[PDB]
Design an enzyme around this catalytic site. Structure first.
Site, mmCIF file in Angstrom:
data_model
loop_
_atom_site.group_PDB
_atom_site.id
_atom_site.type_symbol
_atom_site.label_atom_id
_atom_site.label_comp_id
_atom_site.label_asym_id
_atom_site.label_seq_id
_atom_site.Cartn_x
_atom_site.Cartn_y
_atom_site.Cartn_z
ATOM 1 N N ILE A 13 0.854 -1.179 0.000
ATOM 2 C CA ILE A 13 0.000 0.000 0.000
ATOM 3 C C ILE A 13 0.901 1.243 0.000
ATOM 4 O O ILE A 13 0.731 2.107 -0.844
ATOM 5 C CB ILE A 13 -0.966 -0.027 1.196
ATOM 6 C CG1 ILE A 13 -2.081 -1.059 0.988
ATOM 7 C CG2 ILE A 13 -1.516 1.365 1.501
ATOM 8 C CD1 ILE A 13 -3.108 -0.677 -0.043
ATOM 9 N N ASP A 17 7.091 -1.902 5.567
ATOM 10 C CA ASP A 17 6.115 -1.612 4.539
ATOM 11 C C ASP A 17 4.724 -2.114 4.967
ATOM 12 O O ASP A 17 4.580 -3.000 5.771
ATOM 13 C CB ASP A 17 6.535 -2.195 3.178
ATOM 14 C CG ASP A 17 7.105 -1.149 2.214
ATOM 15 O OD1 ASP A 17 7.705 -0.134 2.717
ATOM 16 O OD2 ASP A 17 6.872 -1.301 0.969
ATOM 17 N N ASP A 123 4.700 13.107 16.657
ATOM 18 C CA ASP A 123 4.714 13.130 15.171
ATOM 19 C C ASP A 123 3.300 13.478 14.685
ATOM 20 O O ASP A 123 2.704 12.790 13.840
ATOM 21 C CB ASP A 123 5.232 11.803 14.571
ATOM 22 C CG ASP A 123 5.819 11.952 13.175
ATOM 23 O OD1 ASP A 123 6.230 13.075 12.841
ATOM 24 O OD2 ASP A 123 5.855 10.955 12.419
HETATM 25 F F1 LIG Z 1 -0.526 -2.907 11.771
HETATM 26 C C1 LIG Z 1 -0.391 -1.820 10.964
HETATM 27 C C2 LIG Z 1 -0.828 -1.906 9.668
HETATM 28 C C3 LIG Z 1 -0.722 -0.784 8.864
HETATM 29 C C4 LIG Z 1 -0.172 0.406 9.360
HETATM 30 C C5 LIG Z 1 -0.056 1.609 8.501
HETATM 31 N N1 LIG Z 1 1.115 2.360 8.521
HETATM 32 C C6 LIG Z 1 0.914 3.307 7.633
HETATM 33 N N2 LIG Z 1 -0.314 3.239 7.017
HETATM 34 C C7 LIG Z 1 -0.806 4.083 5.893
HETATM 35 C C8 LIG Z 1 -0.333 3.546 4.545
HETATM 36 C C9 LIG Z 1 -0.876 4.400 3.402
HETATM 37 C C10 LIG Z 1 -0.472 5.856 3.561
HETATM 38 C C11 LIG Z 1 -0.917 6.393 4.910
HETATM 39 C C12 LIG Z 1 -0.375 5.537 6.053
HETATM 40 C C13 LIG Z 1 -0.964 2.142 7.602
HETATM 41 C C14 LIG Z 1 -2.370 1.727 7.346
HETATM 42 C C15 LIG Z 1 -2.855 1.679 6.036
HETATM 43 C C16 LIG Z 1 -4.158 1.272 5.826
HETATM 44 N N3 LIG Z 1 -5.002 0.896 6.799
HETATM 45 C C17 LIG Z 1 -4.524 0.945 8.054
HETATM 46 N N4 LIG Z 1 -5.202 0.663 9.206
HETATM 47 C C18 LIG Z 1 -4.354 0.896 10.266
HETATM 48 C C19 LIG Z 1 -3.143 1.313 9.816
HETATM 49 C C20 LIG Z 1 -3.227 1.349 8.393
HETATM 50 C C21 LIG Z 1 0.258 0.442 10.683
HETATM 51 C C22 LIG Z 1 0.149 -0.672 11.496
#
Ligand SMILES: Fc1ccc(-c2ncn(C3CCCCC3)c2-c2ccnc3[nH]ccc23)cc1
Length: 289
Positions: A13, A17, A123
């Site tokens: 995504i 990562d 942050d």
């Molecule tokens: F267990 C975890 C799984 C994903 C993330 C996460 N980190 C960053 N993001 C986004 C990616 C896309 C750009 C904005 C930050 C996620 C993330 C992406 C999609 N739906 C999610 N639900 C909870 C976190 C997360 C963090 C912990």
């Protein structure tokens, strides 16, 4: 690939990562974060401990699963939607006053919840707030506890000591003046950073944004100086005084003061009512067609 028992990994995504996945068993999409078992700096397990302590709070993402599989440590979350940065970009870097105020109400509430769990975020930026999907589409969530720290003892409620001579760990754009001065971050600092985020949404950028310099550490010096030479009345000129009143209040806070979150919410609520807006959760991006 068969992460856990019941999760299928999909394609990345973005940014270890982040991947799209499926809870095969429940028939729901999920977000999966992988980290290699041998990095120099293992962080995911630490982060996951904090996400677990936050669970059950409004607008905290729900952990489905933590574990290890093959070469990876793994955390699985319910899927969320785009960030405020993504939705801001999608809206041509212009939010209405109504949208800023709808977001500010929720955003103060999330920071307050984190603080209630004995942590500070450090942050606070548009990229670390995501809108929910489906039934949860009116709900602002907060993510990313990689830079978070305990500010008091869970039991003794004993504040961490006043310290100096620190580095700027988070994002310089939204950092507090006290952070630029190298002072230890506390509750006030998360809130001041939110203050800059809100004016960012109002203006489309911040006046210390996009400063050229040769080195990185020189760029932080330049941002610090710009912030410290830009009065709050100048930053906020042409917007309702509440944005200024909020930033002034934050800058008045003592290191170990408990902020009056309620007062800050009421500030924007009173403005909201004076403008004749309704809390109906119709953000600018909901009106796209
Ligand atoms: F267990 C975890 C799984 C994903 C993330 C996460 N980190 C960053 N993001 C986004 C990616 C896309 C750009 C904005 C930050 C996620 C993330 C992406 C999609 N739906 C999610 N639900 C909870 C976190 C997360 C963090 C912990």
């Amino acid at each position: 690939l068969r992460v856990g028992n019941r999760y299928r990994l999909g394609r990345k995504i973005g940014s270890g990562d982040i991947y799209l996945g499926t809870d095969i068993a429940a028939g729901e999409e999920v977000a999966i974060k992988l980290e290699c078992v041998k990095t120099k700096h293992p962080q995911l397990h630490i982060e996951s401990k904090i996400y677990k302590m936050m669970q059950g709070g409004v607008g905290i993402p729900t952990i489905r699963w933590c574990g290890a599989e093959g070469d990876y440590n793994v955390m699985v979350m319910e899927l969320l939607g785009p960030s405020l940065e993504d939705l801001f970009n999608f809206c041509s870097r212009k939010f209405s006053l109504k949208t800023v105020l709808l977001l500010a109400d929720q955003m103060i509430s999330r920071i307050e919840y984190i603080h209630s769990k004995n942590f500070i975020h450090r942050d606070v930026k548009p990229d670390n707030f995501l809108m929910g999907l489906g039934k949860k589409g009116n709900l602002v969530y907060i993510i990313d506890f990689g830079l978070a720290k305990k500010y008091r003892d869970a039991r003794t409620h004993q504040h961490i000591p006043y310290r100096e001579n620190k580095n700027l760990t988070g994002t310089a754009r939204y950092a507090s003046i006290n952070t630029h001065l190298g002072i230890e971050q506390s509750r006030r600092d998360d809130l001041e950073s939110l203050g800059y985020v809100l004016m960012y949404f109002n203006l489309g950028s911040l006046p210390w944004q996009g400063l050229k310099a040769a080195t990185k550490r020189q760029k932080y010096e330049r941002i610090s100086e710009k912030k410290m030479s830009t009065p709050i009345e100048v930053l906020c000129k042409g917007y309702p005084s509440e944005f200024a009143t909020y930033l002034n209040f934050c800058r008045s806070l003592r290191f170990d003061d408990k902020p009056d979150y309620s007062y800050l919410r009421q500030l924007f609520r009173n403005l909201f009512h004076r403008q004749g807006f309704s809390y109906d959760y119709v953000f600018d991006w909901n009106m796209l067609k």
